[PDB]
Design a protein around this nucleic acid. Structure first.
Ligand SMILES: CC[C@H]1CN2CCc3cc(OC)c(OC)cc3[C@@H]2C[C@@H]1C[C@H]1NCCc2cc(OC)c(OC)cc21
Ligand SMILES: [Mg+2]
Ligand SMILES: [Mg+2]
Ligand SMILES: [Mg+2]
Ligand SMILES: [Mg+2]
Ligand SMILES: [Mg+2]
Length: 81
RNA sequence: GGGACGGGUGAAACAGGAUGAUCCCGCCGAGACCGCCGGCCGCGCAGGCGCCUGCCAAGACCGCCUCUGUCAAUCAAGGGCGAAGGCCGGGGGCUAGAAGGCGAUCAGACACCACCGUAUUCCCGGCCGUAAACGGUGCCGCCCCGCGGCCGGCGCGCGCGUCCCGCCGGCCGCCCAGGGAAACCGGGAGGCUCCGGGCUCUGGGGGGAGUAUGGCCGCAAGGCUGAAACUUGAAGGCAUUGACGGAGGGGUACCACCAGACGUGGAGUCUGCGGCUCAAUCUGACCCAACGCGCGCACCUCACCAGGCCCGGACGCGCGGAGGACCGACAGCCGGGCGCGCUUUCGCGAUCGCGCGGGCGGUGGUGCAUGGCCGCUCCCAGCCCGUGGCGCGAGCCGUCUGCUCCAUUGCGACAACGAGCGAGACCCCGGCCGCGGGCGCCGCGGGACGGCCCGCGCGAGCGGGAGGACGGCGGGGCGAUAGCAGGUCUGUGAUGCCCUCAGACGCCCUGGGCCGCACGCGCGCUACACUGGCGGGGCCAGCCGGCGCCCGCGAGGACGCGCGGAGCCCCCGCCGUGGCCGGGACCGCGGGCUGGAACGCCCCCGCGCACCAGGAAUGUCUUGUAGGCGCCCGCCCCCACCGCG
């Protein structure tokens, strides 16, 4: 499985926009661990958790290098003028 | 001049060439025709119109404080012009080319393709008078959204450009209203059921039939005009959804191909399927999507054939019955046998007997009356809902002519917005690691996620390299909407309606048959040998699993207890290319097992069929895979060339 279904992407986007300060991209361990938290998000199945975490890391580094539309980063401070 | 082919086709073959072709070059003759410029340019009443030079007459448009004064529009009759082909009489003869000839293609080809070639194509004079002669839209006249291009003429403005602002006329494109059955028109096909500007022509369901008979015209071919009888229930127009296409564009798959591998069809044989035979050889299914499939047929299984027992007829109503309803039997004959039948005479006692209503039962029929279960479409990626919008409407958008994915899987848009099903996720199995427990290795968890690096791409995602037990859908299960006259009434206390119901299609018993064989083929098995056959020896599997002693050559047999695994292969020798020690079909004595009963199955001696690698055709397959080798379960009294593993 390489193409990721819609559910993965939508939930991953929600997670990033919600928990951004504690998702360091480029690692598959931190993000998996954080997604394990129920205060963060709940995954019924192991494989789904790994899949979601992987997409979350790829989205997070894509964003840290160049933020995207549809994901809110509160960057006004450096673009509010 | 030079020296061997040239022509033509998808590929070829007829015609041409040492009598020098094809090719190069120069000259000569004749007759057609008028290119690239050439056009949402133009002219003309239409048909139609393209070399240079000269001559002749003509025409529309524009400009005008020119002239006349209703002189106009449309039109049967009548007159004139009129593509191409065709005809008459004269000229001319190069290309092409009806007819004709010939070579190919084809089952045929007198057609499409190739080659030769008459009339014709050209000019003069004259007939004919037809075309999808189409803008499939008659002529005159009025009003009418907006934008724009080109042609001709004239005027205004300036910074004088072949500038831009206008007017008339012409040729075009898009288009709001409006119109329409709609396609579409909008310089009208508008101003019209709110249905009257003027003139002429045509039509009244489809065929018969533009035919017959008359008339006029013409050399002719033919043109103009133009019925009836009879027959028929639809024929047609515009548009929607599907299916199909020897239509185009994107994709995809060893049930498709490339590259290979292993095979089948050639023999012998197991089995099933048609045909023949019999008393019966019981039946279902016939391209994918019937033919080792409806889970192993001596009796049952079993319907089919030859024969025979029994009522095992509930429950109600009417009549009879213990002064005796119904039921069994020793002995002798006929009967495969039975108190089956008969011949004498004993026994039993209401568990009922006859009729009428009313049952149960039945591998009997319709799978085209049905339920249920499968097969196929489908080893697919597709299917729909609420609100909203477009159309009179069936319907359309949502649900994608962009880029990606094996995938309506995703990125990014858009009169659509928002959800759902299928796909994924999901469950079983195996590879690595940990904990716990442990008669027997079996319970709970981690781990792999396109995660890291480098290239690209906004994007999702593609290519390469690592590290790791494993790297990119590892093998299976589940399986959308809608549908089929697919199979099944012979799987069932699943069933409607038919047929059978006391000489039974009920149930049971003895036999036979389903295996019978001039022949056609479907899935398989054994071989055609030296990469081998025989003998002796050594040795390791998993689904899982039972052994000792003694007789017997072996298959097997009598005892007694709980204990236990192979072929290929490797080593040593013989055989030595001979249908031979390859091959083991077929057949004759014999010894055993199961079973009430061998037609069934094993072992021993003997005989030793075809087969020398298999035509036209055709099937399957990408890693622990094909192929080769063997081992257990299923149905099973005995037996596996079958099927699941
Ligand atoms: C009109 C002549 C026909 C003669 N043949 C028959 C055999 C044949 C075999 C071919 O396979 C190689 C072939 O490929 C081009 C052509 C032929 C010709 C076919 C001719 C039939 C003709 N009409 C049908 C379709 C067709 C297609 C063609 O392909 C272009 C073609 O080539 C000239 C001719 C034809
Ligand atoms: Mg002519
Ligand atoms: Mg007309
Ligand atoms: Mg009217
Ligand atoms: Mg009418
Ligand atoms: Mg009519």
């Amino acid at each position: 499985g390489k193409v990721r279904t819609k559910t993965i992407k939508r939930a991953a986007r929600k997670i990033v926009e919600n928990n951004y300060e504690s998702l360091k991209p480029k690692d598959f361990q931190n993000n998996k661990a954080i997604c394990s938290k129920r205060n963060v998000a709940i995954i019924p199945s192991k494989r789904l958790r790994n899949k979601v975490a992987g997409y979350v890391t790829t989205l997070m580094n894509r964003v840290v290098k160049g933020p995207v539309h549809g994901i809110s980063l509160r960057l006004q401070e450096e673009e509010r003028e």
